[PDB]
Paper text:
Since the expression levels of the native bR, SRII, SR1-8bRΔ(0–9), and bR0-9SRΔ(1–8) correlated with the stability of the (-4, +47) region of mRNA structure, we introduced into the wild type bR gene two silent mutations (C9A, G12A corresponding to amino acids Ala2 and Gln3) that increase the free energy by 6.2 kcal/mol and significantly reduce the stem stability. When we utilized a mild detergent for solubilization of E. coli membranes and the non-denaturing protocol for protein purification, bR expressed from the optimized gene retained its purple color. With the wild type bR, D85N and D96N mutant proteins we set up nanovolume in meso crystallization trials which yielded crystals within 5–10 days for all proteins. The crystals belonged to the spacegroup C2 with three monomers in the asymmetric unit that form a trimer. Typically for in meso crystallization, the protein molecules form membrane-like layers, with purple membrane-like packing within the layer. Despite the absence of native [name] lipids, the intertrimer distance is essentially identical to that of the crystals obtained with purple membrane-derived [name]. The structure of the protein and its trimer is also identical to that of purple membrane-derived [name]. Data reveal the essential features of the structure, including the retinal cofactor and the hydrogen bond-linked cluster of water molecules close to the Schiff base. The growth of the first highly ordered 3D crystals of bR expressed in E. coli and the similarity of its structure to the structure of bR obtained from [name] show the aptness of the presented approach for the expression of bR and its mutants suitable for all scientific and industrial applications. Our work demonstrates that bR expressed in E. coli is readily crystallized by in meso approach and, therefore, native lipids surrounding the protein are not an absolute requirement for growing well diffracting bR crystals.
[name] is a light-driven pump that provides proton vectorial transport across the cell membrane of the archaea. It consists of 7 transmembrane α-helices (7TM) with the retinal molecule bound covalently to the Lys 216 residue and belongs to the 7TM protein superfamily. As part of one of the simplest energy production mechanisms in the cell, bR is of great interest for bioenergetics. BR is a widely used model for expression, folding, crystallization of MPs and X-ray crystallography.
Numbering used by the authors:
A (entry chain C): 4 to 231
B (entry chain B): 4 to 156, 162 to 232
C (entry chain A): 4 to 232
Write the structure that this text describes.
Amino acid sequence: ITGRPEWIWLALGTALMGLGTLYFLVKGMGVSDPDAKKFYAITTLVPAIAFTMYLSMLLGYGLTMVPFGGEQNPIYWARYADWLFTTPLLLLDLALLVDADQGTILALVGADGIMIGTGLVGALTKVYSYRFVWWAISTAAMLYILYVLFFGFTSKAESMRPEVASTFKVLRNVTVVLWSAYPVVWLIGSEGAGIVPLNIETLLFMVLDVSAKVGFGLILLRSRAIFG
Amino acid sequence: ITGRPEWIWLALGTALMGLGTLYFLVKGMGVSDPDAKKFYAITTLVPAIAFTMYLSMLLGYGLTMVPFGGEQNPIYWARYADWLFTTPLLLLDLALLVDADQGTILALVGADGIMIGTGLVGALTKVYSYRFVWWAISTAAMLYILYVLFFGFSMRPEVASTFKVLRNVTVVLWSAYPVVWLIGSEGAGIVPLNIETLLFMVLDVSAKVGFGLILLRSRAIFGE
Amino acid sequence: ITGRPEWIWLALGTALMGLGTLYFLVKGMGVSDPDAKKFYAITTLVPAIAFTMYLSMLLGYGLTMVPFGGEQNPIYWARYADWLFTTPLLLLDLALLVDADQGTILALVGADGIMIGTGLVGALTKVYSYRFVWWAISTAAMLYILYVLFFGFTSKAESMRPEVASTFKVLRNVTVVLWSAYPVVWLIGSEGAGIVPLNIETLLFMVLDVSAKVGFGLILLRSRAIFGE
């Protein structure tokens, strides 16, 4: 397990997601309000799933080798299995906060599925050039998501009660800033250009993941915005 | 890319699904009615997902080789990844149009999953004879879905007329899929892969973009 | 098809899930109550999905080989593809009976996904010791589910009409008993310690599966509890 330099970040990630899950689990005990139960369920599931995928990477299961650019490249595919479930859950937290229309929720979840799915195909693609075609489609989907979060129902948040509008705006900002970093890290890291070593890329995703999951959840579950 | 003769149909499919997606995206802008939003979201996602899977097939990612009949057979598995998501969305469009009960929506989506899932298992199965067992199970699931669309469902006249048209389009186009599979490279191998690819492309664009044009052009999508 | 000794149990499972599916399909015909329609849809899909996965195992498609402990180990991965969909559906039946809040349903479905997903990872893991780490995580998720069924639903079912309360308690007990057996069979079977041969393990899972699906469904769909109003 300790052979590759990035093991320490995978271990740390596993530990932080695990601790985060247990905290949210305990914190959610006794909560009887139906709306709050939804938020605790969603928000506890996110780092619980991430925990399993961090462990998969730590133990070697979530790592494969993909040929491109004339070499065999180490790819952690477990990330996508994590994000496939956790990113729409995070979007669901936001959508519930502002009471979004079901059509808008479906649009977000589907666009997010496309984003992660094309990211995965890009990550596993054996023809170097095509990798970035997938990256571009995935980024278009992300920009669509960010557009909806800002110009999609941001008006609905404003016309909610102050505690909701306020918590939403904070979490929206966190989301846009943190999520926007992912395509950059992918682009300069091992999946893409190979400018940053895998060790550092893994550290970067770990810091992003923990912030976007546990950080995000702390802010959300600490707020009275979750109560109906 | 140009190495496989079917590339031209995969390229055309990619372009038409993409163009269709962009059109539905723009057309859906500034739509505020909750029900209409639902239909636009569903109907826009359909060719968006199909666009990605056509591109996957065009670029070679969504192609594999399955041994059966003593040979190595080219199988585009990407189709099932597409249909797994897009066919239930299309059924959802129809179900919402008639305000179907949740139990019925679950039955349709579930049967559809079984249809595509067994289709995929058949497509990847290495014993030639068994491939057709899976085809028969999948076809039974399709027949169940068709039965429900005709017998398993009192609505305003715009809704009733758009539904009937979309249902008939669906029943006719979907029924062609099992035939194309049976005679094509996945089944008997009577029709060569480049022609089969052309056939699925015409069917897919009609069942997705054509279907969507009829639906999103109708007043049926707006909630009284 | 008869080349592996467990074939007979896979054939029997296929037939029992198939028959159960056809019986539930026919029984559900003409049911117009919206609530009952949900229960029939859920409950019929369960054995229908199980039927396809039993057939996949029977035909050899849902079998792979995984090296660990100095052997090539036969692993039926099709079980996880089955359980991934059928276990959440079974949980859904229970949740609807007691009119569970959405948040509780999502918690159950999410925990169930983790249970099956980590079970699958454990099943395919080539480092022998790590297989049991996954098993333990999966078992933790199962225990969480069982906790919810007892300290979330049993409380919400008691405050319901008597037919419902009664049918739920039976189905809850059937579920807790049967589901608890799965991690044990896995642990001592081919996926784990290898104390019980594969043919016997397949018999065990078949009896459990048929009871947990068709048995469960027979108890549920016979009850008046599936009707609303």
